Amino acid sequence: GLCLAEPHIELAGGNVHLITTKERWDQKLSEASRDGKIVLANFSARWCGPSRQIAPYYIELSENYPSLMFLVIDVDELSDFSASWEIKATPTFFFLRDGQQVDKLVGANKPELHKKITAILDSLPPSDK
């Protein structure tokens, strides 16, 4: 499920990077671009059950799949930024190469998030593997 667009729990454990400045977004996307990495960007809200639901799995996946750069954006901290990204629901996952969409998942679905991660890494060119 999802919430249409606050207990103290971790959204940014493991290898997940918290994004609550616009510059960190640009810093991380620029790093991923320089390093030829896909970015997984999780736009979440701490008050949203489903965002919290997927959180520990997202964190575990960040440790299983270090080839991908895992971000979490708190939509209530970067609200103007999230609006510009047309976030309608949380959690929304964008898979981004150089900041453009290569895949997308909306909602807290563990099996499909995992499938999308493996598929996207499989389709990397030999130069990027």
UniProtKB/Swiss-Prot annotation:
> Residues at site: Contributes to redox potential value?
49-50
Q: Per its UniProt entry, which superkingdom is the organism in?
A: Eukaryota
Key words, A-Z: Cytoplasm, Disulfide bond, Electron transport, Redox-active center, Transport
Show the disulfide pairing: 48-51
List the active-site residues.
48 (nucleophile), 51 (nucleophile)
Q: Name one GO cellular component term.
A: cytoplasm
Q: Which Gene3D superfamilies match?
A: Glutaredoxin
Which Pfam family is one of this chain's hits? Thioredoxin
Tell me, what does this protein do in biology? Participates in various redox reactions through the reversible oxidation of the active center dithiol to a disulfide. The H form is known to activate a number of cytosolic enzymes.
Q: What is this protein called?
A: Thioredoxin H-type
**What species is this protein from?**
Populus jackii (Balm of Gilead)
